[PDB]
Ligand binder design. Structure first.
Ligand SMILES: CCCCCCCCCCCCCCCCCC(=O)OC[C@H](COP(=O)(O)OCCN)OC(=O)CCCCCCCCCCCCCCCCC
Lengths: 68, 57
């Protein structure tokens, strides 16, 4: 069921009367990026790998020696 | 006050007919059998989907 494209997913659920191909241009999202559809990849090597998007809070000193 | 047996409208034979032939049980069985010839409610997920509304979360 994850392979149903969004918009068709809503139509198939009786969300809307008019199918995606029949919808006017005004009621279509404008995108500045290329649109790509990707289904649920669980149980595959394509599964989502989460991670922390921030570097650590406290930055350690870069050790440097000086001569006396 | 609850009525006694002697103040009953139905004869003993009619009551015994209902008692031995299970009248209401056959009425229940008939109501059950009538459902057997009606349209079922099932939908064939994932080829069909139940209703979804704009507000769904
Ligand atoms: C008028 C003159 C008649 C002369 C004699 C008649 C000859 C024999 C008659 C043939 C049938 C006799 C067998 C069934 C008699 C039913 C008696 C009965 O109702 O049992 C009552 C029993 C509790 O006993 P009791 O205390 O007396 O009830 C009062 C409660 N305040 O509680 C019970 O046990 C409930 C009844 C049991 C029913 C079992 C149901 C399971 C299977 C259902 C069978 C229906 C047929 C299915 C076939 C599909 C339909 C085509």
């Amino acid at each position: 069921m994850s392979q149903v494209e969004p918009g068709w997913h809503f139509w198939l659920g009786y969300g809307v009367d008019t199918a995606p191909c029949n919808t006017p241009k005004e009621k279509l999202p404008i995108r500045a990026y290329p649109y790509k559809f990707q289904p649920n990849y669980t149980g595959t090597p394509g599964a989502f790998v989460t991670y922390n998007t921030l570097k650590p809070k406290i930055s350690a000193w870069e050790p440097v020696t000086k001569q006396r | 006050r609850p009525a006694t047996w002697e103040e009953s409208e139905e004869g003993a034979l009619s009551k015994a007919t209902k008692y031995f032939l299970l009248a209401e049980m056959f009425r229940g069985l008939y109501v059950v059998l009538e459902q057997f010839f009606r349209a079922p409610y099932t939908i064939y997920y994932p080829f069909e989907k139940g209703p979804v509304s704009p507000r769904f979360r």
